[PDB]
């Protein structure tokens, strides 16, 4: 029971995702480092947050 304040909807069982503790969505996801915007149904969740792989693809 919260709302996704990325894109601006409400969410709680739907295309939600678990970042290890915050509720994203897949397409909201904000780097946890870069704070780039990664959107896409593509990336990945850890540190109990969500990191962007384009991060990782700086290197
Ligand atoms: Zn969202
Ligand atoms: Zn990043």
Known sequence: ???CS?????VYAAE???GAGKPW???CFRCAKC???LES???TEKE?????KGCYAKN
Not at 6 to 10: F, L, W
Not at 48 to 52: A, L, V, W
């Open 1 to 3: 029971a919260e709302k």
């Open 6 to 10: 990325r894109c601006g909807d409400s």
């Open 16 to 18: 939600k995702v678990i």
């Open 25 to 27: 969505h897949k397409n």
């Open 35 to 37: 704070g780039k915007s």
């Open 41 to 43: 149904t593509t990336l």
């Open 48 to 52: 109990g947050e969500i990191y962007c």
